[PDB]
Design a protein around this ligand. Structure first.
Ligand SMILES: Nc1ncnc2c1ncn2[C@@H]1O[C@H](COP(=O)(O)O)[C@@H](O)[C@H]1O
Length: 354
C-alpha cells in the first residue's frame, strides 16, 4: 500500500494522492509547475501546484507559509480556494514538498489580454477583480503585486485572484526567474508608504493593457519603468514630489520632464468597441475609469469603493459579492515574522498537517 504515486512532468516528479489522475501541465511560475488533474473522489477536475522545498530560503518560505494560512482562512468567490493540501513525506525530517490542490480554471489573464473583449465581459472581469481586492482589504491584506499571470478566468467569464501579494514587511534569490514589476504602483516603485488604493494602480495597468493589448509601462528595471510612466502620464505635479524622501525626491525632480499625453490620445476610440451608441457610451465610461485609476499620486487616485460605484462597473454591483464577512486570520503575526530555514520547515509542516 501507498496512498501516493509518482509521475514525471517536465524536469519534475509529481508524487500525488491516487485520487488525482491524468496530470497535464497547465502553467509555470516562480514556485514551479502547475498541473491539471481529474480528482476521482470529487469527480471533477482540479489544479495541483507543487512547492519544492519551500523552506529552502526566507523568500519562498515566507510566501509559502503566508499563502497556506491565507488560502485556508479566506472564503470569497473571486479569490482562489484550496481544495486540498498534502505532502507525500511521512515525517518532519523527511519533509520536502507541499502540494496545493485548487479548483481548476481555464486560463490566466495574459491569455484574455491577447483577445478583444466586449464591454460586458471587460467590465465584469474588472468588477470581479475589485470584489476580490475589496475582500482582501477588508481582512487587512493589501496585495501590491497584482498581475495578469496571477489572475485566472473560466470560459464563463468568472475570475479568481491566485495569490495574496507582498507582506507589509520587507528578498535575494539565486535564480533564472525574473520578477515582473510592470504593474507595481509609483508608491511601491519609490517606496513611499501606501494605502488600499495602491492596488487600483495595478488594475488600471491591467485594464489599460486589456484595451491596448500591450504592457503599459514596460521597463528593464524601475528607472525605465518610471520613465515609461511619466512619458505617458506626464511628470507628476509638485504636491506629489513633496511627499517623497529627499533622496528619491531629488531623483524624480531631475528626470527629463514630460507634460504627458491625454487619455483620448493614450487610449483612442479605435481600441474600443464603438459601433453602436451603447458601445460609444461604454467606451467613454471606460476611458473615464482608466483616467481615475492610472493617477500617479495616490491621494487623487480613485479608491476601491468609488471604482465599484463607477458607471462602467456598477451594473454588476451586488452587496453579497461586495461587503462580505472578512476572514478571521487566526495568526496575526503573519505578514512580518523572521525565521531560519529549519524553523520555517517546521512552521510549514505544522500547517500542512494542521
Ligand atoms: N488554479 C489554477 N487554475 C488554472 N490555472 C492555474 C491555476 N493556478 C495556476 N495556474 C496557471 O499556472 C500559472 C502560474 O501559476 P502561479 O505560479 O501559481 O501563478 C498561472 O499563470 C496559470 O496559468
Amino acid at each position: 500500500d501507498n496512498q501516493f504515486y509518482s509521475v514525471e512532468v517536465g524536469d519534475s516528479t509529481f508524487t500525488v494522492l491516487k485520487r488525482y489522475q491524468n496530470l497535464k501541465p497547465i502553467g509555470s511560475g516562480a514556485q514551479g509547475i502547475v498541473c491539471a488533474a481529474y480528482d476521482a473522489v470529487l469527480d471533477r477536475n482540479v489544479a495541483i501546484k507543487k512547492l519544492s522545498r519551500p523552506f529552502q530560503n526566507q523568500t519562498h518560505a515566507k510566501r509559502a507559509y503566508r499563502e497556506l494560512v491565507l488560502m485556508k482562512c479566506v472564503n470569497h468567490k473571486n479569490i482562489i480556494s484550496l481544495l486540498n493540501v498534502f505532502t507525500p513525506q511521512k515525517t518532519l525530517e523527511e519533509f520536502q514538498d507541499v502540494y496545493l490542490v485548487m479548483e481548476l480554471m481555464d486560463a490566466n489573464l495574459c491569455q484574455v489580454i491577447q483577445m478583444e473583449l466586449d464591454h460586458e465581459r471587460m467590465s465584469y472581469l474588472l468588477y470581479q477583480m475589485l470584489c476580490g481586492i475589496k475582500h482582501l482589504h477588508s481582512a487587512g491584506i493589501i496585495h501590491r503585486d497584482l498581475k495578469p499571470s496571477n489572475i485566472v478566468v473560466k470560459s464563463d467569464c468568472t475570475l479568481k485572484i491566485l495569490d495574496f501579494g507582498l507582506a507589509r514587511t520587507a528578498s535575494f534569490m539565486m535564480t533564472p526567474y525574473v520578477v515582473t514589476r510592470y504593474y507595481r504602483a509609483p508608491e511601491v516603485i519609490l517606496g513611499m508608504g501606501y494605502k488600499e488604493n495602491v492596488d487600483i494602480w495595478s488594475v488600471g495597468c491591467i485594464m489599460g493593457e486589456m484595451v491596448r493589448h500591450k504592457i503599459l509601462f514596460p521597463g528593464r528595471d524601475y528607472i525605465d519603468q518610471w520613465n515609461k510612466v511619466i512619458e505617458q502620464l506626464g511628470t507628476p505635479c509638485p504636491e506629489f514630489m513633496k511627499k517623497l524622501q529627499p533622496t528619491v525626491r531629488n531623483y524624480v525632480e531631475n528626470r527629463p520632464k514630460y507634460a504627458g499625453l491625454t487619455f483620448p490620445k493614450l487610449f483612442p476610440d479605435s481600441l474600443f468597441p464603438a459601433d453602436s451608441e451603447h458601445n460609444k457610451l461604454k467606451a467613454s465610461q471606460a476611458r473615464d475609469l482608466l483616467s481615475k485609476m492610472l493617477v500617479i499620486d495616490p491621494a487623487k487616485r480613485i479608491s476601491v469603493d468609488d471604482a465599484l460605484q463607477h458607471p462602467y462597473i456598477n451594473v454588476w454591483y451586488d452587496p453579497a459579492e461586495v461587503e462580505a464577512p472578512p476572514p478571521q486570520i487566526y495568526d496575526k503575526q503573519l505578514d512580518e515574522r523572521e525565521h531560519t530555514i529549519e524553523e520555517w520547515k517546521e512552521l510549514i509542516y505544522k500547517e500542512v498537517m494542521n
